[PDB]
Paper text:
[name] has been shown to play an important role in EET but is unusual in containing three CXXCH heme binding motifs that are separated by repeated (PT)x motifs, suggested to enhance binding to mineral surfaces. The amino acid sequence of [name] contains a cleavable Sec signal peptide followed by an N‐terminal lipid anchor and four domains interspersed by repeated (PT)x motifs. The first domain is not predicted to contain any cofactors, while the other three domains are monoheme domains (Fernandes et al., 2023).
The 1.8 Å crystal structure of heme domain II consisted of six copies of the protein within the asymmetric unit, comprising residues 352–414 of the [name] amino acid sequence. Like domain I, domain II displays His‐Met heme ligation (in this case from residues His365 and Met392) and the imidazole groups of His365 are within H‐bonding distance (2.7 Å) of the carboxylate group of Asp372. These negatively charged residues might help stabilize the Fe3+ state over Fe2+, supported by the pH‐dependent voltammograms which show that these two domains have E m that is significantly more pH sensitive than domain III. A highly anisotropic or axial LS (HALS) type “large g max” signal (g > 3.2) can occur when two histidine heme ligands are perpendicular to each other but is also typical of histidine–methionine heme coordination where ligand orientation cannot be resolved (Zoppellaro et al., 2009).
Residue numbers in the entry: 1 to 66
Write the structure that this text describes.
Amino acid sequence: ADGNGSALYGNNCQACHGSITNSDIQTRTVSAIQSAISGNRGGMGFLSTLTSAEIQAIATSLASAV
Ligand code: HEC
């Protein structure tokens, strides 16, 4: 689906990290995102609801922005 990663990021990340083209995230990988969720960095533990496909789509979009 065109726009999936950016839409996911806008709904789940942007409130705390900025818009995707101006994001403050450093490590734009699935493992980095999953580690932050698991460690509840910034309260992100609630994002356990994301599938692995969705985290992939977010990380790909972030890495492409950039
Ligand atoms: C506020 C409730 C947040 C939401 C929603 C998301 N993030 Fe987050 N994240 C937040 C904080 C306060 C921190 C810690 C920064 C610090 O000073 O330690 C983080 C951490 C990350 C990280 C690791 C740090 C980095 O590489 O920049 C990543 C990779 C990350 N967060 C990604 C991320 C994603 C993909 C989100 C949407 C699924 C997301 N965060 C939401 C605060 C909040």
